[model samples]
Target: SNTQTVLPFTGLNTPSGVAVDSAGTVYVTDHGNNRVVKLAAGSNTQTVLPFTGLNTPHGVAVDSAGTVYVTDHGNNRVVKLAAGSNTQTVLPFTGLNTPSGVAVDSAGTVYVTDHGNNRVVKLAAGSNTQTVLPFTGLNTPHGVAVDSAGTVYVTDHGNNRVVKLAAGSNTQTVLPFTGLNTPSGVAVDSAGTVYVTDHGNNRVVKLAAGSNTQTVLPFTGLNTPHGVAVDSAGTVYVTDHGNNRVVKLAA
Candidate 1:
């Protein structure tokens, strides 16, 4: 299939991150609105959690239990919304620093990139006590995702690189410094290829597994691609921040 369909949101302002839940419900981070909005996966309608006390919401994620986690960049904290409720800040403040990206594992552990702190923090799903800074010394980490094996991949935007953390290791930079321009969001396919969106370059790059080889997608038409998500059916969706739209590519 061709990746030519550019879905435009007339009322959306500066959409940053996006994720699809198990049921294929799409959630987008509305940075300008300072909230997370839910949209029908294949339609144009949307539902927003318009709260008054949010600070530039940057990224969004939905866990298996359907709990929604949003990275409030301006507030330096992560907020959670339960499956069915308008309740705000169910998880409370967790002392994060300009957190930008977030992802959760099958075990319900939340992994967040503290951009200002240059590290990734993993907190137990239910309790704030259990924590792990699995990776340290990153350069402006922006986005994160987990593979089926529980390995983690983080986009180091400042360094223009991607780091992968194995299931039980400290953390390793898998995709080496490839001169990527402001790599913002990263998504891994079932085949293990890492799809990274370069914000500065306005394009998406695919990194082969076990190597640093990258295949740059067509950027002539892209504009500041910010976030990416891969479906089990091998379809990739990218959020084009600068162009104010989304791109769909077949893997």
Candidate 2:
């Protein structure tokens, strides 16, 4: 059985999102506090990165170069913070309707869930052109993450399913897995395993790379679980929204 450890930073008001960087540092969106925090690898210290003009920052992600991307939900925009400088620049895009989730692909392309519009949009690399994906079967999409091959996974909260958009295609395919209840956040491992938070069900579900069979991790004592991510070592981190804390589960 894996053991659970509550990290040092507690008393966070509604920590909604989490992402692990290359150096094992954890960046979290303090949604309730309206800021983004960085937890050092082995220290209890919390560093508040400079996020001026941020409004209800929710979903967060760090790219290969350590640049941070956040969904400034309240402002209806997505902002990118440079790696070392921490400078903020709102990407040039329009037609964003309450964008919620944000993720960066291996190629550094930005994918965001326009929650209110029930769609996902991608900001291409270099050119930074905005393209609304062709598929439109989403219903209140929440969280999104891309695997090694650029396959996108989205938590279709309203539909009670997770949808996948292949790297080079516009067709959306709903995974065969079931038993999800108000799923919120999602993450993918290098091996392509998908980890999702079934918020309404109050548990996390793991689906293997190419199989429909799923495993509901034996993590109990949760209250409104929200975001979930798995590190390279297989350790899982989850945000217990109802309880106002983040829990770390052994790999």
Candidate 3:
């Protein structure tokens, strides 16, 4: 009969990156533990996915077709888990040095941020080769997201800013942001709100649709929030880094 002040998914080790699919299923990367955990819709416990030998898994994104993509940070590659498969395949990409964040759109195109290489790249539909995005001077970009309109968003962590590249255009605009200390993840809701895990600030910040100003969510004691995501129903999920738990707030 009361609000859930904090929905914590405990028993995680350095959990980073979170995603919720259309059916309300949640997946989080237990980064330090080298595994990915999942929670069925309306379920309270998290179960580990059956992909073996994951080394420092970080970013996770589930596509519309139910394919799970994970950034194996230590392996410097991205792995894809089919809708109902126990095994995963390393995505075919070259020159990826410490890939961290990943995102996929409805058309099945894949996007990734090469943290060590300091650039963003995408694997277009029907194309096996990855092409670097035309954003200049992106230092240590962490998270990548693509909205329904094809707009791409990136958390330029080393630059302390967020940048957006419009669809069908190479023009990149750094979003209006100040004091974004070591932001780790970025996600855009259907309504165009951009959520960021302000890691150093230990809070979640949202830039509403069509607005230049950003606001913090009502999380009282988040400890180094690392990854941020939004479900289809508008619930915001965040990976609380230091707390080693995941927390959510519904729209």
Candidate 4:
């Protein structure tokens, strides 16, 4: 436990997602409890946000303006809790069949994985539209993330692969890896380094920016990890769902 910080579990059961803001505050969705919680920057004390009627929150992300977004899987909707507000406003995305992963880039562009629909959708900052991202074979896309350069990444769970879609392009390139057992959560850091929670493999793998090789991190004995995020300083956060806890790996 010395190498990785296993923070005290604060009423989190089957916690499925995580996100970090610019302030370093970490947000996690307590999947079993129908709530989202936050861990303050540089502190171990955890607190739950005042959200009600959250059913099976799957993925979470924090935008530049401090607005937190989550996918309510059971309810088939996505909601955003704005800065300095306790109430959540559901985004008007119709035909969402149990959405899963959610991510927001530097430009405030929101991306979501409509799991049951087998597609990834995008939402502009101030628009009510949910545009489907152009991609092929989105079989059970479990996680979605976008980098600073507008490059989009997603874990094609059913396909057992990770795919990257560059900015201003329609071509999708598969990350050069195979035999990925149900990769779930995907994230990109400041330097474009991509991190993914290999759920079925029970480990986290990262691909460095501008590199073709991928390497596994040091966390061991993990079971069914569901969510992953990297903060500004390069620290890694993983929602160890099977264990019902979150693990922190500092830069």
Candidate 5:
């Protein structure tokens, strides 16, 4: 295990989601425990949100202001936790049905995947108004991420592909790939490249903006990977759900 040692300790069980803030704090969704947790800056172990009633949290994301959002699959809701506390809740509860993926745009608008409902919805910051995207034909949509240009990327689990939605439009297309098994989580980097977790393949893959070429992870030791994120320095973090841990890869 010495060959794999990093600065901080490991993450948690069924880590279905991951998100990194500008300040470098890492948040992960512990799905089995039904909560979202933080890997403190310089500390080991984990600290969970103090609030209650989360049901099978699956994906997580953070906004510019440090607020964290998690998709509570079991409860069919999206929970939000502010910067300095463990307080959380089922946010914008009007039309969500078992959300699976969560992402925040530059404008603070939260985008979530209504997995069971087969659509994506957006909610503005600090408000409960809900707007559903018109992209139809989705099959078990599982993850969400917004690029710098406001384009939204979603992983269609049931379809075994990733789809990208144009900025300010609802049109979507399957990302060009031939052998994707189960694409789940998605995250976009500063350079606009998109990374997705291929759960059935047990690896993470990268695709450039507007390009369909796929690049698999160099290190091949992940098991049942689900969620993925990229840091400011270009480091890629993937949640290995089957192994109950998180892996960090350098670009």
Candidate 6:
């Protein structure tokens, strides 16, 4: 059972990614506008983040402290907006080519999908250096997410499959599931259930923990769903790009 509501955010152009903070503030990357905006959960007040000078931002994620991380796609870098302070910092790492997705784990480790590079890289907590996790057979990876155990999930857009890298290991395994058409974004719940946006299919699908069984959420009527995230309360948020709005699905 789910209830869908289109968030009251206007003036958005080609919204691509979404992230929900611990306090329920919704942060989104306005790609076409080259800016990020946050919306207070209840009041729905929209505030454009002060981090300017971005180019075609795509994916976004919030750390435990509420700090926001965004994938500056067109700029070919990942930028961070501190939790309490709005200071923007370009993560000091090289070897990025058109990064499209970003995710932070419980330990503050940042994972980014170097889409153009055909791989994902990990930035350890409090470290300026990054290590590229060795992965093969990836076709234009798009969105990424990490679960509690540090396992990483990536949406292989060009391959139409979801790949998972176990925590502490760089090996990649394709999750056995069907009905994916240009899959883009992916999120995992505390229970280890995986949720992914089937961009070409115009719907979201849920894969139960540790199995090939899947249940498609009743989020039909969506157009070009790009990114998907689950809040602390199990509510699902999706960037409905074609509709030009974000839709919040109540748990």
Ranking by lDDT: 6, 4, 3, 2, 5, 1
State each model's CA lDDT, in order: 0.77, 0.85, 0.86, 0.86, 0.79, 0.87
lDDT tens digits by residue: candidate 4, 51-139: 66888899998888899999998889999988889788898788999788998888888899998999999988789888998888779
Q: Residue-wise lDDT of candidate 6 within 1-251, one digit each (tens)?
A: 46788887878888899998878889889999999988887965798888868989999999888888999977799999887675798997687898989999999899999999888889988899998876688878899999888889999887899998988685788887698998899998898888898989888888887775898888857878998999878889999888888988877
lDDT of 1: 0.77
Regions of model 1 farther than 4 Å from truth: 50-52, 90-93, 130-132, 210-213
Model 2 CA lDDT for position 150? 87
Residue pairs in collision within model 6: none
What would the C-alpha RMSD of candidate 4 be, to one decimal place? 1.6
lDDT of 1 at 166: 86
Candidate 1, residue 75: how far the Cα is off, in Å: 1.9
Q: List the residue pairs that clash in candidate 2.
A: none
Give the higher-TM-score candidate: 2 or 3.
2
Scored against the true structure, residue 8 in model 3 reaches a CA lDDT of 42
Give the distance in Å from residue 28's predicted Cα in candidate 1 to where it truly belongs.
0.9
Model 1 residue 207 CA deviation in Å: 1.4
Two-way lDDT contest, 2 vs 6, winner: 6
Report the number of the highest-lDDT candidate: 6
Instruction: Give the runs in model 5 whose Cα sits over 4 Å from its true position.
Output: 1-11, 209-212
> Model 6, residue 64: displacement in angstroms?
0.8
Clashes of 3: 0
Q: Candidate 4 — worst ten consecutive residues by lDDT sum?
A: 1-10
lDDT of 3 by residue, 1-251 (tens): 11333454567889988988898888999988899988887776778887777889889999888899999977788888998898897888888887889999888889999998999999976677999999988899999999998888999887899998987887899887778899899999888888998888877898888875788888656789988888777788888887777878877
lDDT per residue as tens, model 1, 1-251: 55555554456678888887877777878788776777666777677875548878888888888888888887787878878867756354366788888888888778888788788878775674636556655778999998878888899877678888888886475565476889899888768888888888767888776775878765347768888887777677778776667667765
TM-score of 6: 0.95
